[PDB]
Design a protein around this ligand. Structure first.
Ligand SMILES: Nc1ccn([C@@H]2O[C@H](COP(=O)(O)OP(=O)(O)OP(=O)(O)O)[C@@H](O)[C@H]2O)c(=O)n1
Ligand SMILES: Nc1ccn([C@@H]2O[C@H](COP(=O)(O)OP(=O)(O)OP(=O)(O)O)[C@@H](O)[C@H]2O)c(=O)n1
Ligand SMILES: Nc1ccn([C@@H]2O[C@H](COP(=O)(O)OP(=O)(O)OP(=O)(O)O)[C@@H](O)[C@H]2O)c(=O)n1
Ligand SMILES: Nc1ncnc2c1ncn2[C@@H]1O[C@H](COP(=O)(O)OP(=O)(O)O)[C@@H](O)[C@H]1O
Ligand SMILES: Nc1ncnc2c1ncn2[C@@H]1O[C@H](COP(=O)(O)OP(=O)(O)O)[C@@H](O)[C@H]1O
Ligand SMILES: Nc1ncnc2c1ncn2[C@@H]1O[C@H](COP(=O)(O)OP(=O)(O)O)[C@@H](O)[C@H]1O
Ligand SMILES: [Mg+2]
Ligand SMILES: [Mg+2]
Ligand SMILES: [Mg+2]
Lengths: 536, 536, 534
């Protein structure tokens, strides 16, 4: 079978939704029984996102294979069943760095290494690699057409198009079609100027995804179609919707899939799209609603928690519950006190790094624990709990994590190597990607997950100090999950609490609108119950 | 004192002479008593030229400080007395690689590292660094305006201009002004289109260096001046000349220096320009002429030997001899035989790497030696000699260099570590940049250089096997120079030969038109003598 | 039969030779029995080219239908047998003028007239109007790609190509590939940037015509081919040649025609460049050489006299003679004297307008007639002759043309209305092709070998029929007449070696391939004289 590529670009502005539009398209092609995939090309120099601050570009998606990537990969996984790999994401940095080493060790044989073709070639290699055995590959070019940081990417793809030929390649360009309140009309001009931009680099768009407040009247669509030398049909309107789960539907509604299948000469049986409809439906027909407090540190940038939010959302879906997420900065907790934790049906403590707020978190766990509030802790969210418990239950006085106080008497949380006693006795690092995990019989999670073992994704160094374990266990805490090896503790639960769970891995990276996720589903049902009973 | 920058760019085509034009300008500013320097920015990805094949971009200039750089740095040194340092040359590669490590180790604090400003900033840093304590810095931007590989450089400099302000910055742009044989006229159009290119990136040229076959009539100059929004005076004609030594003169002739001093508000006393005139004069008034054979391997690309050629040229100057360089590929030597070495007044064997031709070279040395032909060998040129001698004089049968035959009985040439015997006995790497060297009493060179010690530049690994030395010495060869430490052999001479010298370092990197060079001068006088006596 | 279009564009610099390139390309397609045509679009405001001076843009070509056009049309006509009409040449000025006009008479219905589409449409209209009934049309866009001057033209064609489809549209782009002495290499960069310029405007060239002083190495070519996404076969090398007449050959030699034929799905029998071959052959093998003197005004712009020059060049092909053309300023005749006419095997006085050096010309005319030197005078050149004769022979003191001296007394030359005698007794501008009646015993009748002929005019001032009989009497021959008012078209001097002068511009009908009676004969004479004189 011949592979096909859909190059996705955006113009006018960034924050256009190129990531989502591609996933949506993928979803709709998935639905037509096609072997599909997506890949994101990042113009930034960071070798990988492993370095970026969540507040810069958002959260660090972690793939099964332990790669740290752009959040768009999440979008990818929540729209198509294909699993993302290191292969699905790459930055200029990565590109350059490879080329540099190659060169540095002489793979170019004293040749002058240039942007064209050396660099372009490298880009192309990676794209094909990502394509590798798929009917359709969606290649998201990050950035805005017309800036310079993406020139190579573009040149690269332009080349590919020429080589592969247009029978297996398409140019899908997202553009902004602003609404002029005064004139009372939408403007194509921007689209015009942008398209000219593409042309000017040898690229002629095949399809135009017109973003805007509202729909893009046939009138203007025609206008566009005409000046872009694009078939009217190829001009799609992509207005702002109240739920991205609808996006797939609009595309289809406009026979994008078709257009796509025809251009590529593929056999695409008619689809149902029932799964998306169902999601939408569940979404719109809630029974109860609740408020969930998400207490963290990077809350200034919600995208810093993309996946988690979504996961909560899916939770609601699976339970016909409407979730209202109250974003809470730990600072303010230690600052203004628990008072703020008033009015919550459940609480979530996500991962992070710092100490910046840790305290607040802890306090919070404590609060949720003491006040029997359904609580869910992830990564940092788990430690904070261990801590709260050890401190105020095991009476480990000033329990902590070597990450924040390398010399605590009780380093309940610490790297393996650091592992010591309250005395000082010893024993005779970065966990990334998918990891098997054995669930404990008689544990909530064993129930929820409904299986002895599961697989979740990791992104952390600090572990639960096995040395101080038995002690805490003895205090009451319960180990619900472990990881083979040094049987490292992965999940813990508070025994006789309505719903109190905490884990190392990032369940969120595994949840989806379509199939939800056990923990969140449970977390969610729990929160409802709470609210219901808070007046039962 | 405030530093000033002259940004040099070229348009239309490459091979415009931007390197030379800058040196020429520098020379003329030097001459007006200004503290000046030049720097070259290379758009290529190679971290440094240390990797490039001479045939790709030409020879690898080596600075005092042992850096491997663009040949333009040579041009630089042959026009101004300032010495070049690693600081005077840099590539995108170097730029990127620095940024990558910085980032890789987190100097950006989880920030998204971008082209703008991260990369630009890095470029700027380096430029200032190069500027550091100089009245005037000429910054040569490599490549052609309008390609993408130099966008960052340009953006970078544009920024600098804005920051520094136009009281301390200028844009000098070289352009092509083609001659239309049919129309019988020169065309500015190209210049027009190029300038538009600059503008389009925020840059407005301050001066225009118009290249062409002939001079650029005032008519067109005016035309240009007018549409480029450039003072007529700022429009210079830079025709093709029979000797680059004249270039400086034209610039001056057009009061470029002045223009420059005024724009920068500098105190520039009137100059003489006598040194350049003198050079030109010597050049034009030769007494004898000779033919010098340059037998090597990379001869397909003359630029592969820039410096050497020049050095020979300077030799001629200092001796009022006209040198005719017969370029000779070793291959053809071993192939067609010595026959070809017929009709030479002297012979030069430059450096290189391979084995590709080595044999030929050797044969050649032999030839020159046997036939009493003034011979000069550099780097590879030296080994080849050692070899010839050891083989055909010391009777070391198949003497060689571990670089070409790691298991010879007699590895006369070898890395220190490799050093062994003809038996196999032992003893109980890259030399770069300026190195002191002690001359041997009673040696030609001691005479020529007129000093006990000198300083030459190195670029090699393989050394003369001290183990097999005494043997060869005994055979007749003479060590004329050594390098302290392992008193490594640097120069050798054949005792009772008209003029037979060979050395490790690259004298060429130290010669100039203005002050010539001893060895070459001698080499040269010798060749004359030969020719004169070949009919005396 | 679906009309096909070849858009001819040029980059890097102006003066690339698009006109010729296009003409040569047509020549070939014609040679494949193709119904071809060519048109030229000028980014200029001058409505009519008939206004601009020759020192400006060269000669004003005149078509059959009387249109005053850009010289390129001359090229066209000398490469293809198709005939040009006004519909084959247009300026921006014409377009706007039409639109404006068409606008003012409410044709637009209070609509806003815009560059796009209004202007662009206007253009497309003309383009099609001009490609009416041809399988192949060659549209040459004037100006350099990248200049604002021609965007509308460029946009118009882009549109067409689109509407029409690639199965009948091609983009042939002329480019400059300079040679760098130092480097010793030809440069493709400019081409690169040039193509970018095109792409920037929505056009992607189909063929590349590489202009250079030397041929373009495959190596470089291949490069280009790549970066421009054109088949190597589509990248033509078109070096500087010693004679444009080889162009066709070059082109075919490279298979361009085949490319076109295939691209257009046209049946094209193998080409026949026999005639082009002949021309080249003749050109290269002269058996004799002469030096012909062209005495006129605007000689500071050879292009001002294009068609004439060629015609000469062509008379030589026919006679296998090498023509040495000596450009001479009539003024210098007035000034320096008849000395300059010293050493010429024949004299040619071209037309023109303005009193400037008319007198120098008269002297020249005399000289030739008096010294028995073959003479050919066109338009002004004819008058000058009449004048000469009238005076120097008919003793018509200070004879002249009311174009320079209205109180003549002897206005042997003047508008028809103006006709009047010496005593004072009595009783617009001609353009295009017109029948001419040849006088029976006239030499000109002989050369032409026919009672009537057709030639093109571009003038106002006419032979004063009033003073005719007089001069006619002094012994002057009236070789050709118009029609009705039997106006004098040609006059021959009695028993001079070869003395001919005419009103119309024969040069507009000469051709390398078919030559021209007058010129041929003229040149023939030049020789005989040259010969005799020795
Ligand atoms: N490359 C182009 C394209 C169009 N136009 C001009 O664009 C004008 C129409 O644009 P405008 O009225 O501003 O609106 P639209 O192009 O329809 O776009 P919109 O309403 O979406 O802003 C026309 O007169 C046309 O001459 C132009 O000058 N250059
Ligand atoms: N940005 C520009 C600049 C100039 N022109 C047009 O350029 C023409 C003149 O150019 P040309 O005759 O080709 O030669 P020059 O510009 O003088 O340049 P050169 O002779 O060096 O090629 C003018 O009609 C002017 O309208 C244009 O269309 N767009
Ligand atoms: N649009 C482009 C095309 C190429 N390059 C760069 O172009 C350089 C090569 O150009 P150069 O050596 O100057 O000559 P060519 O383009 O090969 O052609 P010519 O020598 O005929 O001018 C490479 O570094 C490549 O990265 C660029 O920056 N932008
Ligand atoms: N059609 C839409 N309606 C509403 N919100 C949208 C739509 N498309 C995208 N979004 C939102 O806009 C932002 C851009 O999404 P993304 O696809 O990641 O943009 P980018 O183009 O930068 O990749 C996200 O916050 C996403 O939730
Ligand atoms: N004015 C000139 N006359 C003759 N040769 C020149 C002139 N300027 C430059 N050259 C030659 O042209 C080439 C370009 O020189 P250089 O300055 O290195 O070009 P670039 O613009 O690529 O840096 C060299 O071979 C040099 O010898
Ligand atoms: N291959 C060629 N060799 C020599 N002269 C040429 C060639 N092609 C064109 N020319 C000449 O160059 C000039 C350019 O004229 P023209 O063809 O009108 O160029 P343009 O129309 O592109 O301005 C003319 O004098 C023409 O005769
Ligand atoms: Mg995205
Ligand atoms: Mg340079
Ligand atoms: Mg033309």
């Amino acid at each position: 079978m011949t592979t096909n590529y859909i190059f996705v670009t955006g113009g006018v502005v960034s924050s256009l939704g190129k990531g989502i539009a591609a996933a949506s398209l993928a979803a709709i092609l998935e639905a037509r029984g096609l072997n599909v995939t997506i890949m994101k090309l990042d113009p930034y120099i960071n070798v990988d996102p492993g370095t970026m601050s969540p507040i810069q570009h958002g959260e660090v998606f972690v793939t099964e294979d332990g790669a740290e990537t752009d959040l768009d990969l999440g979008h990818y996984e929540r729209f198509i069943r294909t699993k993302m790999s290191r292969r699905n994401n790459f930055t200029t940095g990565r590109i350059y760095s490879d080329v540099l080493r190659k060169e540095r060790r002489g793979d170019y044989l004293g040749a002058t290494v240039q942007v064209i073709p050396h660099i372009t070639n490298a880009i192309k290699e990676r794209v094909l690699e990502g394509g590798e055995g798929h009917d359709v590959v969606l290649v998201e070019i990050g950035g805005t057409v017309g800036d310079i940081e993406s020139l190579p990417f573009l040149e690269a793809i332009r080349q590919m198009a020429v080589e592969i030929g247009r029978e297996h390649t398409l140019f899908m360009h997202l553009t902004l079609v602003p609404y002029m309140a005064a004139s009372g009309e939408v403007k194509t001009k921007p689209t015009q100027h942008s398209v000219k931009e593409l042309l000017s680099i040898g690229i002629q768009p095949d399809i135009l995804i017109c973003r805007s407040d509202r729909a893009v009247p046939a009138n203007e669509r025609a206008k566009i179609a005409l000046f872009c030398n694009v078939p009217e049909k190829a001009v799609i309107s992509l207005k702002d919707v109240d739920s991205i789960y609808k996006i797939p539907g609009l595309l289809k509604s406009q026979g994008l899939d078709d257009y796509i299948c025809k251009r590529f000469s593929l056999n695409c049986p008619e689809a149902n799209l029932s799964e998306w409809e169902q999601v939408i439906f569940e979404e719109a027909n809630p029974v109860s609603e609740v408020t969930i407090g998400m207490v963290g540190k990077y809350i200034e940038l919600p995208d810093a928690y993309k996946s988690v939010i979504e996961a909560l959302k899916h939770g609601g879906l699976k339970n016909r519950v409407s979730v209202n997420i109250k974003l809470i900065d730990s600072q303010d907790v230690e600052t203004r006190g628990v008072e703020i934790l008033k009015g919550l049906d459940a609480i979530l403590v996500p991962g992070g790094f710092g100490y910046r707020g840790v305290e607040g978190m802890i306090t919070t766990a404590r609060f949720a624990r003491e006040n029997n509030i359904p609580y869910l802790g992830i990564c940092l969210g788990m430690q904070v709990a261990l801590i709260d418990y050890a401190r105020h239950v095991a009476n480990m006085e000033n329990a902590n994590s070597t990450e924040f106080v390398p010399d605590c008497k009780y380093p309940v949380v610490a790297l393996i190597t650091e592992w010591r006693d309250e005395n000082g006795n010893v024993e005779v690092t970065m966990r990334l990607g998918a990891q098997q995990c054995q669930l404990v019989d008689d544990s909530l999670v064993r129930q929820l997950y409904n299986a002895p073992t599961i697989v979740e994704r990791h992104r952390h160094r600090y572990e639960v100090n096995n040395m101080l374990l038995k002690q805490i266990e003895d205090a009451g805490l319960r180990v619900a999950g472990r990881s083979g090896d040094d049987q490292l503790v992965e999940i813990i639960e508070v025994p006789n609490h309505p719903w109190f769970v905490a884990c190392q891995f990032h369940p969120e990276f595994t949840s989806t609108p379509r199939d939800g996720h056990p923990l969140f589903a449970g977390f969610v049902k729990a929160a409802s119950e709470f609210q219901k009973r808070q007046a039962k």
